[PDB]
Design an enzyme around this catalytic site. Structure first.
Site, PDB file in Angstrom:
ATOM      1  N   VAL A  27       0.851  -1.204  -0.017  1.00  0.00           N
ATOM      2  CA  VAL A  27      -0.095  -0.180  -0.027  1.00  0.00           C
ATOM      3  C   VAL A  27       0.976   1.231   0.018  1.00  0.00           C
ATOM      4  O   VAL A  27       0.279   2.462  -0.093  1.00  0.00           O
ATOM      5  CB  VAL A  27      -0.708   0.364   1.086  1.00  0.00           C
ATOM      6  CG1 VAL A  27      -2.133  -0.973   1.204  1.00  0.00           C
ATOM      7  CG2 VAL A  27      -0.110   0.034   2.424  1.00  0.00           C
ATOM      8  N   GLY A  28       2.156   0.989   0.342  1.00  0.00           N
ATOM      9  CA  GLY A  28       3.020   2.346   0.210  1.00  0.00           C
ATOM     10  C   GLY A  28       4.363   1.801   0.887  1.00  0.00           C
ATOM     11  O   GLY A  28       4.423   1.173   1.962  1.00  0.00           O
ATOM     12  N   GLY A  30       8.572   3.498   1.959  1.00  0.00           N
ATOM     13  CA  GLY A  30       9.081   4.744   2.231  1.00  0.00           C
ATOM     14  C   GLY A  30      10.539   4.574   2.824  1.00  0.00           C
ATOM     15  O   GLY A  30      10.934   3.486   3.167  1.00  0.00           O
ATOM     16  N   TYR A  32      10.826   4.921   5.832  1.00  0.00           N
ATOM     17  CA  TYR A  32      10.380   4.372   7.000  1.00  0.00           C
ATOM     18  C   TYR A  32      10.539   2.731   6.797  1.00  0.00           C
ATOM     19  O   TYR A  32      11.243   2.386   7.379  1.00  0.00           O
ATOM     20  CB  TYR A  32       8.991   4.838   7.440  1.00  0.00           C
ATOM     21  N   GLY A  33       9.722   2.448   6.011  1.00  0.00           N
ATOM     22  CA  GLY A  33       9.701   0.884   5.831  1.00  0.00           C
ATOM     23  C   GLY A  33       8.272   0.662   4.934  1.00  0.00           C
ATOM     24  O   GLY A  33       7.418   1.190   5.493  1.00  0.00           O
ATOM     25  N   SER A  34       8.345  -0.309   4.087  1.00  0.00           N
ATOM     26  CA  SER A  34       7.198  -0.735   3.098  1.00  0.00           C
ATOM     27  C   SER A  34       5.913  -1.009   4.121  1.00  0.00           C
ATOM     28  O   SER A  34       6.238  -1.745   5.245  1.00  0.00           O
ATOM     29  CB  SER A  34       7.475  -1.640   2.184  1.00  0.00           C
ATOM     30  OG  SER A  34       8.642  -1.335   1.569  1.00  0.00           O
ATOM     31  N   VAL A  35       4.812  -1.095   3.804  1.00  0.00           N
ATOM     32  CA  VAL A  35       3.649  -1.436   4.495  1.00  0.00           C
ATOM     33  C   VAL A  35       2.770  -2.151   3.716  1.00  0.00           C
ATOM     34  O   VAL A  35       2.524  -1.963   2.507  1.00  0.00           O
ATOM     35  CB  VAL A  35       2.723  -0.142   5.029  1.00  0.00           C
ATOM     36  CG1 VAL A  35       1.479  -0.460   5.886  1.00  0.00           C
ATOM     37  CG2 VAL A  35       3.678   0.612   6.003  1.00  0.00           C
ATOM     38  N   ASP A 165       0.147   7.360  12.921  1.00  0.00           N
ATOM     39  CA  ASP A 165       1.203   7.788  12.370  1.00  0.00           C
ATOM     40  C   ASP A 165       1.857   8.990  12.936  1.00  0.00           C
ATOM     41  O   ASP A 165       1.874  10.197  12.512  1.00  0.00           O
ATOM     42  CB  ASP A 165       0.995   8.208  10.850  1.00  0.00           C
ATOM     43  CG  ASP A 165       2.052   8.150   9.890  1.00  0.00           C
ATOM     44  OD1 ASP A 165       3.175   7.574  10.473  1.00  0.00           O
ATOM     45  OD2 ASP A 165       2.194   8.354   8.759  1.00  0.00           O
TER      46      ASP A 165
HETATM   47  C1  LIG Z   1      -4.579   2.420   2.330  1.00  0.00           C
HETATM   48  O1  LIG Z   1      -3.084   2.813   2.692  1.00  0.00           O
HETATM   49  C2  LIG Z   1      -2.635   2.457   3.869  1.00  0.00           C
HETATM   50  C3  LIG Z   1      -3.390   1.856   5.217  1.00  0.00           C
HETATM   51  C4  LIG Z   1      -2.293   1.931   6.438  1.00  0.00           C
HETATM   52  N1  LIG Z   1      -3.408   1.343   7.706  1.00  0.00           N
HETATM   53  C5  LIG Z   1      -2.697   1.597   8.946  1.00  0.00           C
HETATM   54  N2  LIG Z   1      -1.463   1.974   9.224  1.00  0.00           N
HETATM   55  C6  LIG Z   1      -0.629   2.583   7.988  1.00  0.00           C
HETATM   56  N3  LIG Z   1       0.712   3.212   8.102  1.00  0.00           N
HETATM   57  C7  LIG Z   1       1.545   2.899   9.458  1.00  0.00           C
HETATM   58  C8  LIG Z   1       1.983   4.309  10.028  1.00  0.00           C
HETATM   59  C9  LIG Z   1       2.834   3.975  11.114  1.00  0.00           C
HETATM   60  C10 LIG Z   1       3.241   2.763  11.892  1.00  0.00           C
HETATM   61  C11 LIG Z   1       2.603   1.767  10.980  1.00  0.00           C
HETATM   62  S1  LIG Z   1       3.101   0.033  11.707  1.00  0.00           S
HETATM   63  C12 LIG Z   1       1.445  -1.180  11.465  1.00  0.00           C
HETATM   64  C13 LIG Z   1       2.021   1.747   9.877  1.00  0.00           C
HETATM   65  C14 LIG Z   1      -1.151   2.469   6.411  1.00  0.00           C
HETATM   66  C15 LIG Z   1      -0.539   2.961   5.345  1.00  0.00           C
HETATM   67  C16 LIG Z   1      -1.245   2.876   4.181  1.00  0.00           C
HETATM   68  O2  LIG Z   1      -0.718   3.669   2.789  1.00  0.00           O
HETATM   69  C17 LIG Z   1       0.651   3.594   2.743  1.00  0.00           C
END
Ligand SMILES: COc1cc2ncnc(Nc3cccc(SC)c3)c2cc1OC
Length: 348
Positions: A27-28, A30, A32-35, A165
């Site tokens: 979903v993204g 960066g 930081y780290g991919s998610v 976030d």
């Molecule tokens: C639909 O899009 C997204 C849905 C997301 N849902 C929850 N957290 C996110 N980010 C995040 C922020 C800080 C810590 C962690 S650890 C689980 C993860 C996401 C990122 C997305 O898109 C990049």
């Protein structure tokens, strides 16, 4: 017991997660780290799984990792995103090199919302009330989100809001440059470095957010740092002698004094047709001098939230010890502290 893990490549990255998580979909990605979005078959939840990037490369990265795990492990409030799980394929500190964080999956942020539904005053009431309910809880642990924006607010079908976030790094100069939403919700004292900021910078963010909900437009869409300051001072007026003293930066203070003095505008005429109580609340939040802004706890008792306010259901947070922030350590030492936090986690 250690669950079993399985591997798979997700964009030049081999992800190694416990069998419970299925159908991972990016979903993204960066710095930081991919998610990845995924289905936690053990709970039936839609989850966001973040694999931190080189968590223990630099001393800086090692601390950031620790910081984010400590913070996510502490947040336990209905209006804040907490941690559902954290894991690593490593079987010992020796192997420990990757960290995966798991939280609820955001369906739609607040922007998603402002561009579909036509927020009614009640909607604004409920949405801002929740942000303030979560901020009170957060600020009570002496935690400063310092990055509140529509894109950091998850809102479900029932209009239930959660804050996520948090500001865990320090946006690059480039990040904050130009016409970007990454700066439109920032308090002036932090955006221009007037002085050492505190939790009150978030209230300014809530102010910008609340105005946008009522008008459906960005409050301070500055094309850059200066333009935005002008946009802000044109509305709240230029600072008086008292605020000027409080501005440590002599450059910044000297710059402000170069501007022609302007009076605070009539918010009734800026937010035409907005609930008089909403107007009044915006005036107490968008105060230039942070010492005089309304606090989250004070705002929850404001008449505008009479409908949702409940003094017995607006909990504060457990003490949050972040003495480590002022501590200097090596990479391996930050990694072990991180490791222990991982092995000591406990699901909700
Ligand atoms: C639909 O899009 C997204 C849905 C997301 N849902 C929850 N957290 C996110 N980010 C995040 C922020 C800080 C810590 C962690 S650890 C689980 C993860 C996401 C990122 C997305 O898109 C990049």
């Amino acid at each position: 017991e250690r669950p079993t893990f399985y591997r798979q490549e997700l964009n030049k990255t081999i992800w190694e997660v416990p069998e419970r998580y299925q159908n991972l979909s990016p979903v993204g990605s960066g710095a930081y780290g991919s998610v990845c979005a995924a289905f936690d078959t053990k709970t039936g939840l839609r989850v966001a799984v973040k694999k931190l990037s080189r968590p223990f490369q630099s001393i800086i990265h090692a601390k950031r990792t620790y910081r984010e795990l400590r913070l996510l492990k502490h947040m336990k409030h209905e209006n804040v995103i907490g941690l559902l799980d954290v894991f690593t394929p490593a079987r010992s500190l020796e192997e420990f090199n990757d960290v995966y964080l798991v939280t609820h999956l955001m369906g739609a942020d607040l922007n998603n919302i402002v561009k579909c539904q036509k927020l009614t005053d009640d909607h604004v009431q409920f949405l801002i009330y929740q942000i303030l309910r979560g901020l009170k809880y957060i600020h009570s642990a002496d935690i400063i989100h310092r990055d509140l924006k529509p894109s950091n607010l998850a809102v479900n079908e029932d209009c239930e809001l959660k804050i996520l976030d948090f500001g865990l790094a320090r946006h690059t100069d480039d990040e904050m440059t130009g016409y970007v939403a990454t700066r439109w919700y920032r308090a002036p004292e932090i955006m221009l470095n007037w002085m050492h900021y505190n939790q009150t910078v978030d209230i300014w963010s809530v102010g910008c957010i609340m105005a946008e909900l009522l008008t459906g437009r960005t409050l301070f869409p500055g094309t850059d740092h200066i333009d935005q300051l002008k946009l802000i001072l044109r509305l709240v007026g230029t600072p008086g002698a008292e605020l000027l003293k409080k501005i440590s930066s002599e450059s910044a203070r000297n710059y402000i004094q170069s501007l022609t003095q302007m009076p605070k505008m009539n918010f009734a005429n800026v937010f035409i047709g907005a609930n008089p109580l909403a107007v009044d609340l915006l005036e107490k939040m968008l105060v230039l001098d942070s010492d005089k802004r309304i606090t989250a706890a004070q705002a929850l008792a404001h008449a505008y939230f009479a409908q949702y306010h409940d003094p017995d259901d607006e909990p504060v947070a457990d003490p949050y010890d972040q003495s480590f922030e002022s501590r200097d350590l090596l990479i391996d030492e930050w990694k072990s502290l991180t490791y222990d936090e991982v092995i000591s986690f406990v699901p909700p």
